[PDB]
Design a protein around this ligand. Structure first.
Ligand SMILES: *[C@@H](O)[C@H](C[C@@H]1CCNC1=O)NC(=O)[C@H](CC(C)C)NC(=O)OCC(C)(C)S(=O)(=O)c1ccccc1
Lengths: 299, 300
């Protein structure tokens, strides 16, 4: 198995740079709107604790420099939506794909197109942790880089980058500007809650091992969802939701192993350990492949 | 700032991918200027594949036997020829989206991005290294042939890999864009085995430095080692020997962290002999060897 990203070209075609004074980050150019983190309007001394509404009233359209490459895009309107700035521009992006804005759930994966000064550098796959951080690779200048999934021809944008925390993980918002998790776009002291293991993805991984013929760990028993959830929390696993049960549907049908039977098999691994064995050639359970990622790479 | 296995943005390559059909075989082609490149085994039937006389099979083919599609559009093949294991299909049109490009042959231990395609449509992108035994550990299913691997320096795409086959161990094999295989493989429908794989030592060392740079250093130690004594232990565990050029290439990481290369070698030597006894590095229970020194630096 591999951490596989979506091809990034449809998103590369939407990346621009937004500058206020000397502050330069990335923005997302879709139709005739550019989306970017509102803190582009902050000075350093203002990042310590900004009054974004007061900073915005002092702004005019002609204080924003939007560039695709080195070509200026004139700004003809501005507004703030939560923690994102929306800049109306005078040119509709001819490379605009079919798109949607979606707010993902913890555990869901997405590709990140890491960008600096509106220029993409790399693409990689991230899982949204249960504590609403992601394990990214972002340097200064990376804010406004986006995360997305591609469904057929349609790009679903789910993440815009805003921050690095002390523990080295990253945090950001959806494309409507709402942070994932409890964080705020201020240069004040913040910290991610303790993380947990993404149970639904571990379960997907067990299904993947079974599809590939590796099935020593299946037992002859089942469990209730609440029983499994109460046990899982004692091992710092995320409790399953009904949505998790539902998205394991295809893998359950592909293998003939009901979700709750796989849960009983996982519970036994949690309670008894691996006892020296491996699954898909590893003593560790993997939690960064969703049910969809598994299908993608097997079928 | 975090360390992640990262592929190049794939857009310049997406704009070159097309579908190529001959007979009952569809796979991917790479359309640069007015030429489409693809694996030549697209011309084979079931029976052909076990011992295909490709020069023989190719001369019996017409330009009109090749259906090339770029999305909703068929491109007219006006000529065909073969270079080693790659078929070249001249078309009446030039690809407008052709990037600045070159064809390169990579060395084992070097890394590249793979754009996995099916029916000419990009499906995923990921990073691979050319293994010392000239396989690559990819994710490729039926219909992936013609998927390409590449690097990008500035705005120049250097193409280095085109996908042809899976081995029974689940690793992958293919050619450069001149059609020459990496390794001892052949585009005939046989189960083939690779030579013994070995671990890319200079890459494990780059990764360990990355693990330090990101605030992880449990595996470190106060011991040191000569280069030759490290190499003796490395070879015992089927790790590649480290050359003085590899040492040099690791300087920037050495400098950046103030850990002498040979000190990181003594750390690695300890891990090889002792295992990780439960512990992990940058998340992994295993020593990762598909990050080059450049990949680590660029990302730090
Ligand atoms: C894009 O503007 C940039 C991207 C960062 C830079 C390095 N890696 C990244 O991902 N984002 C910022 O600089 C943040 C801007 C604020 C308005 C949100 N600042 C930031 O991330 O600062 C971190 C905090 C909030 C000060 S922290 O999490 O408390 C912290 C403290 C000390 C050390 C690390 C983190």
């Amino acid at each position: 198995f591999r951490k596989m990203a979506f091809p990034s070209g449809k998103v590369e075609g939407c990346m621009v740079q937004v500058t206020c004074g000397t502050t330069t980050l990335n923005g997302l150019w879709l139709d005739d709107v550019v989306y970017c983190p509102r803190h582009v309007i902050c000075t350093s001394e203002d990042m310590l604790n900004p009054n974004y509404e007061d900073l915005l009233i002092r702004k005019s359209n002609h204080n924003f420099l939007v560039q695709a490459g080195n070509v200026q895009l004139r700004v003809i309107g501005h507004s703030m939506q939560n923690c994102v700035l929306k800049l109306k521009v005078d040119t509709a992006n001819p490379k605009t794909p079919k798109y949607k804005f979606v707010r993902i759930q913890p555990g869901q994966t997405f590709s990140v197109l890491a960008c600096y000064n509106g220029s993409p550098s790399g693409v990689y796959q991230c899982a949204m942790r249960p504590n609403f951080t992601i394990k990214g690779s972002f340097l200064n200048g990376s804010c406004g880089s986006v995360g997305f999934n591609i469904d057929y021809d349609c790009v679903s944008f789910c993440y815009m980058h805003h921050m690095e925390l002390p523990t080295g993980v990253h945090a950001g918002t959806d494309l409507e500007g709402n942070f994932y998790g409890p964080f705020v776009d201020r240069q004040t002291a913040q910290a991610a809650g303790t993380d947990t293991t993404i149970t639904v993805n571990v379960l997907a991984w067990l299904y993947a091992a079974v599809i590939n013929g590796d099935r020593w760990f299946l037992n002859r028993f089942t469990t209730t969802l609440n029983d499994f959830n109460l046990v899982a929390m004692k091992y710092n696993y995320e409790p399953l939701t009904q949505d998790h049960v539902d998205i394991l549907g295809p893998l359950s049908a592909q293998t003939g192993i009901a979700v709750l039977d796989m849960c009983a098999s996982l519970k036994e691994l949690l309670q008894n350990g691996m006892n020296g064995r491996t699954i898909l050639g590893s003593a560790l359970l993997e939690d960064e492949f969703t049910p969809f990622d598994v299908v993608r790479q097997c079928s």
